[model samples]
Target: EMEKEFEQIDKSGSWAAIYQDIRHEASDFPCRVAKLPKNKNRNRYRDVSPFDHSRIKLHQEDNDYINASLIKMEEAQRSYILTQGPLPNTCGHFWEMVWEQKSRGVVMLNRVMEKGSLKCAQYWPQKEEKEMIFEDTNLKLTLISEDIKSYYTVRQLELENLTTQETREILHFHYTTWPDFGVPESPASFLNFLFKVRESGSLSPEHGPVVVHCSAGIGRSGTFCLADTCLLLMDKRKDPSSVDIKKVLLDMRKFRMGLIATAEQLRFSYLAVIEGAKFIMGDS
Candidate 1:
């Protein structure tokens, strides 16, 4: 009996061995191989803290997380930054986020379809655990900023289903804290898509930085700005007297100080730089 039991144990393996095999051996494992303990689970939460975000506001208001004056409207040809602002803790009609780098000019426009019944689509949350719903109703009205800042708004372009092209009239928005859906691992496709548009070539020039913004204008935008900027820096560092990384970050923060405030955002930027470099070097 004892021998049989020992043989069974050998076949089954120890917990650690089982975990290792599951992670390495299994081709289509359905369950989680690495189980989390209470302490590590809490630590995982702690590690994820850096991704938390607050909503960007339309105006520089009392309860806003950004400075409205910095993100104020600017000419399409010129560059600007979207800092934290004066905002109200309420909703508006048809609130949505939109982004475009077009031939006529770049569009990072937000608007309210109605005044009294604020759209629930657009909003920002200060924590990572918040659930955000994406729909035609809820509006997360984060604006776009010029300059290579760290913060940015994640926007969904509305397309006419038949044409498969983005519709010009309406856009949708959401804060990061809300539930998320359809976040792609590689943004190169989207960047390429945007660049292919009529006038996007001007925005992503080989010479310098372009515009980036989001709600709070610091957190999400950080992901886009830092990465592209790093790509430029690496490319320009042929001799050493190239772009200044610290100065670039500081300048971005001038508008939204908290942009690129987290390690994850920085990592994303690093990856973006690598991808950008690859694209620039014709490695794509």
Candidate 2:
């Protein structure tokens, strides 16, 4: 069915055309908070801003806001807090948001350094070290254990709240090989990494929404949510045909801006979903 849908879209010339419509629809949203007084300068990059309507609001006394979007897919029972990679100054806010949201895990889709550029700050403690403390947020992050994989790294991090003296074990799943503005080398490898996340039960509702982020929190980050939501819908609905991939993507864009950024990214999302569906269905 997925193949036929792609073929049909090809003949109708809607594949490229519909994506344009998606981009245009996203532009109609009111990005009021992108330039808001308190939150404007907190963003890592100027262009990668979250929409005001669905942006995550910090509950701290000082009101240090971070550029993060709370995305909820009720139908699939999936919620993900999508944000950009933390900047040097905003690293405290990043962890503070995670602590405030009660997130059990953080799925980082980018590396600390990419192509000689600082993609993300070293927010967590290093592997060689035992623990690191963020003074700005008054949070202590301890590296409990590390499982280094070929394509990804899984870390067990203990996030301690100094004020409350409460500590929570948070899982950190970092995919190191995915290039910027590009899909993974193979969908199977990506699926394997995703399954590792699922086994950890970080995406469960018992915890707050799992925080997923990349450099800008749009391109690779969007693809991760799109593919995961699609697969979850298929698993719950018991049929892949019941879910409309394009429609689902459009609906998700309503909550956040610039999801599935380019045509290649969109195509990769579908491919990933189809590949994941195969794994869930025991076809592979």
Candidate 3:
């Protein structure tokens, strides 16, 4: 079945061509909500816009709009808050959103500096800095510990509500090696990083949701969610062949705009999902 799917994709005038066509159509859809005066410029770049219909709304006195969306996978019972890397101006609001949503983990797929670009702001505390307090939002983030791996870095962040003195542990999984709008060189390393997040119980239903982000919060972020959702469905059904990769991706895209942005990224998502199914199927 996988062979047949691959053959079909190859025959469809190349995956890259198909993906380009799909993205062209996607661009036609309105994402102007991210451009509204109240919300405009919250995103790092204007082109990287969030669909207004499903964008996350902030329950704050000011800046009620945020460039974030809640993507829910009902069948898999998984949810992810997908958003762009925090902007300097929105850093406080970013933490507030995480706190508001009760998100237990933050899956960061880009570095603060990637390929001579500021992919994301330094939202969290650094090693040299023990803690960073956000006065605007009345929040304090302290780095409790960090585990550095070859392909990723895991940091334990303590998020405190200054007013209430309430605190929670936020697992920050930073995938350090993935390039912008691209997949990892190998799925093994990516899967290892994914399993590490799973082991941390950050993706489980009991938790609010895992906040996932990359540069624009769509390409790499979408790939991660699509692959994870497909693998989860496969595990639940106990049959890798039962999963419909394309259908799942489309369903997820309904929740957030511009998911799995490029055809190359979509193809990479399929490859990762296929590889993950094998691991889940005990095909070692």
Candidate 4:
């Protein structure tokens, strides 16, 4: 039945209508905080911004604002803190959010540098540098180890509060195969990467919401959150067809503006969720 919707959209061309309706329906919510002149630069895209009420608040910093939102999927008992890639100055705030939220996993869907464009800062300790210290926040990140795969890389990292020397371990899941212009090459590969993150229980109810992001924080991050939530709802219902992909995505958009941006993104979410549902219900 889900595939049936995708089928009719392909031939009837209502994909555009759905996309336009989402934009119009959800546009009424104001993002006054995101549009302020002082906070304008914090946003990477003018059209994409977090809702003032749903955005996560940062107390360690003076501004106390971050272009990220805490999206809670209540009955599913899960959350995804959708955010943008770290900016030059907000990198520290990114780490601060991770530290304060006790987030065990961060899912970065885009590269720091894509094509000729620089999408996000190299916020982590890379090969050249084994560690990085943010003096303002007095937080340090050390590279523990890195496991590189064909389309993704998982890194073990250590975070230490320079003030007290207390430390915590972190896992970074980076999806590398996304084209600068389009979605993942295959839904299976994307599902495999997502399941790997799940296997670690990083997104479990026990842990703080996993930080999921792309360049703008909506398109890819929305897809990730929607797909994951659909699987959970399906598992809880014990029936794949019981979940409504469109409704789930639309509900998520209420937390952050314009989630699952384009028609292509919407299509990808359905593909990944239906494909990933088998793994969730099969006891995998």
Which candidate comes out best when scored by lDDT?
A: 4
Local error of candidate 4 at residue 168 (angstroms): 0.8
- lDDT values, one for every candidate: 0.33, 0.85, 0.85, 0.85
Query: How high is each candidate's TM-score?
Result: 0.38, 0.93, 0.93, 0.95
lDDT of 4: 0.85
Compute the lDDT of residue 194 as modeled in candidate 2: 86
Report lDDT (Cα) of residue 117, candidate 4: 92
Cα displacement (angstroms), candidate 2, residue 99, comes to 0.9
Off by over 4 Å in 3: 11-13, 24-33
Candidate 3 yields a Cα-based lDDT of: 0.85
All candidates in order of TM-score, best leading: 4, 2, 3, 1
Off by over 4 Å in 4: none
Instruction: Report the lDDT tens digits of candidate 4 across residue range 1-284.
Output: 47777778878988878778777776447788889899977888888778888898887547888899999888788998999998998888899899888899999999999888989999999872768988777899989899999999999899888887899888999999886547795898889999899988889878888999989888888888899899899989888888888788778878988788678888788889877877777857
lDDT score, residue 95, model 4? 90
Give the C-alpha lDDT of model 2.
0.85
Candidate 1 per-residue lDDT, tens place, 1-284, comes to 12233244356654334323323432221111112242232111122111112123322232222122132112122233332211243222112212222212222322211235321223433233443332432333222222222222333332221223333322222222211111224556434433332134434433122334343345555544544454445555532234443345554443333555444344344444445555555565
For model 1 the TM-score comes to 0.38
Backbone clash tally for model 3? 0
| Best model per TM-score | 4
